[model samples]
Target: MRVLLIHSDYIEYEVKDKALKNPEPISEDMKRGRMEEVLVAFISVEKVDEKNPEEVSLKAIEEISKVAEQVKAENVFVYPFAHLSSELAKPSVAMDILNRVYQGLKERGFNVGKAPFGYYKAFKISCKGHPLAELSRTIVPEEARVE
Candidate 1:
């Protein structure tokens, strides 16, 4: 799992169309939403993450939470972005992992929202000009040995 975290004053997005075949549907109202004082987590579920999806998801949430605390983020928004890695997982696998991450964050009592996966969306973000406002992290799952 790869994440690009941006602490922003506000971020807004509008879903335009499908970015992939049979993409997940976004409601008319959900097609557009704006968040304030949030950590925008641009998550890329990589091929390696498929080996241990749950672990990767946990690591991602933990990593983001650490930064969120530093920036005093009021919420977290998970955006599915594929440009971070060339070795991407299958769409289904990626979406499942994303859902897991979203749920995990919500369970932690964080106001969390996720963008519609596999959709072409246009977004505007006003990032906070702070030292820790923008950062990147790569969560590599531990290797499992099977005999």
Candidate 2:
């Protein structure tokens, strides 16, 4: 039951270059559904020790299905961007694919949580040994107090 929770790609509604403005309420966040501009996809992964590709895919599917059953997510969205650099699109695409796949899981029955952060930020929080990790580091110091 080892599940990795990560951030989501920016949904136009949820995407914030700056802090929110007069947001209605945090809990009702997406009650009105999402903005059309924000699209996404999801990709499933397997355990590091898995030997069979099919088995890995099956595991991912099963886990996703379980997630759907719990959360009851019926629809999915995707976002595509044409950026200047070659490496830029990968993360956005990856996120979109994974989210779409997870949508299936939710429909089937599973608990799901949507995360939001760009690829670089996702890498910073996901794991270690990333060269770009330093650049994504949060400026907050450990001793900082509640604001």
Candidate 3:
């Protein structure tokens, strides 16, 4: 999994249209969510991630939380962004992984918002222009991680 974490003052998104055939249908009201002082994680579920999704998810959450804490972010937003990688997972599989990440973060006690997956969305972001405001990380399953 590839995660691009943006520490933003605020981030808003709307599910404008379905990007794929298997997109999760989102209602008008459900289409949009916004958070202030949050970490927006633009996640790409690559083909390799599908092999050991649970482990990849755990490591991704750990990285996101570590960065969020460093920036004192009060919330988290997980955005499915496939453009970060050339190799992608099946839509259903990717969405499941994203949902797991969202749930995992919420369970960890952080306020969390997840952009509807598998959709063509329009987003507006206001990034905090700090040294650590934007950073990226690649998280692999424990077995794939450097020993």
Candidate 4:
């Protein structure tokens, strides 16, 4: 699988000791999309803090829209794994941030899905059997496959 990890353009997160935020899968199709096994593009939001969360999430949605537009992807998944972390993940917090971004994208007429709760867990999307699996394998190494 050949996977292309496209970070949210507006902001780059640097976590130093902890793992840096990257594109992760939020669903089964998201997994396939990551592998390029399916004709879809996945976009992840930047690791965010509240002071300017609306701004950051807006930027993320814009970036996601652009990629989806360019690829003509039918489905776009907005993956925000940071929202589920022990120190960072919270429903009230995630909802406050995601609501604005979700509304923005919905206004743009795009087909999208909700960001997973601690449910889909982390951002590591599996790309093995999907058509783009080779694409994912081409770029992401085995050791870096999971988060």
Candidate 5:
């Protein structure tokens, strides 16, 4: 997973159109999301992640949590971003992987908000632009990490 974290003053968005033939089912409330004083994790699920999804998801949570702690951000908005990587996973796989990371973070007690995958959306973001405001990360499975 490739994660770009932006410590933002706020983020607001409304889903525009489906990026795929079949997108995840979303409710009225979920269709429009806004969060303030949050760490926005713009994550891309890469092709390699398909080989070890669960493990990759776990590692993604660990990496994101570490950043959130440093930034002292309790609210996190999980955004699915395909542009972060050239070798991206299938929409189905990426959707599942991103959701797993979101849910995993939620289970860890952070205030987590998720933007549904496989959609084009209009968004407004005000980045804090501090020393730790914007960061990028590449998280790979352990097999690729260890010697």
Candidate 6:
């Protein structure tokens, strides 16, 4: 998993159109969503994650949450992005990994929201300008690592 984590004053997004043949089912409330004082993780599921989806998901959650705490943020917005890595996972694998990430954040007691996968979303973000506000991570699962 690769992520560009941003601390934001507010991040608002609206679902635009389908980018995948089958997108996650969502309703009116989910169409347009916004959050304040949130950690927005723009994640990209990479080929390495395909080796062990569960472990990769866990690793991603751990790292994201650690940063959230550092920024004293209570909310998380998981935005799946395909532009971060050249070796992207298949849609099926990517969706599963992202779903697990959402579940993990929920179990960790963070008010988390996941932007719909496989869809084109229009967004406006008020990102913080602090030195630590913008950070990135390249998470590699233990089982997928080669010694």
Q: Estimate each model's TM-score.
A: 0.94, 0.28, 0.93, 0.45, 0.94, 0.94
Whole-model Cα lDDT per candidate?
A: 0.89, 0.31, 0.86, 0.40, 0.90, 0.91
For residues 122-141, could you state the per-residue lDDT of candidate 3 as single tens digits? 99998888999989898766
Model 1, global lDDT: 0.89
Worst 10 residues of 1 by lDDT: 138-147
- The number of clashing residue pairs in model 3 is 0
**On lDDT, who's better, 5 or 6?**
6
Q: Which stretches of candidate 6 lie over 4 Å from their true place?
A: 144-147
Ranking by lDDT: 6, 5, 1, 3, 4, 2
> What is candidate 4's lDDT per residue for 99-121, written digit by digit as tens?
66667777778755444433333
Can you list the residue pairs that collide in candidate 3? none
Give lDDT tens digits, candidate 5, residues 1-147: 899999999888899989889888888898899999999999999999987788899999998899899999999989999899999999888988898999999998999998878889999898899999999999888664332
**Candidate 6 lDDT (Cα, whole model)?**
0.91
> Can you tell me which runs of candidate 3 are displaced by over 4 Å?
144-147
Query: Which of 1 and 5 is ahead in lDDT?
Result: 5
What tens digits encode model 2's per-residue C-alpha lDDT throughout 11-78?
33343332223222234453222322111223322223122333333444455443323333233232
Number of clashes recorded per candidate: 0, 30, 0, 20, 0, 0
Better of 3 and 4 by TM-score: 3
lDDT by residue for model 6 over 1-147, one digit each (tens)?
A: 899999999888989989989878887788888899999999999988988898999999999999999999899999989999999999989999999999999999999987888889999998897987999999977765343
Candidate 5 TM-score to native? 0.94
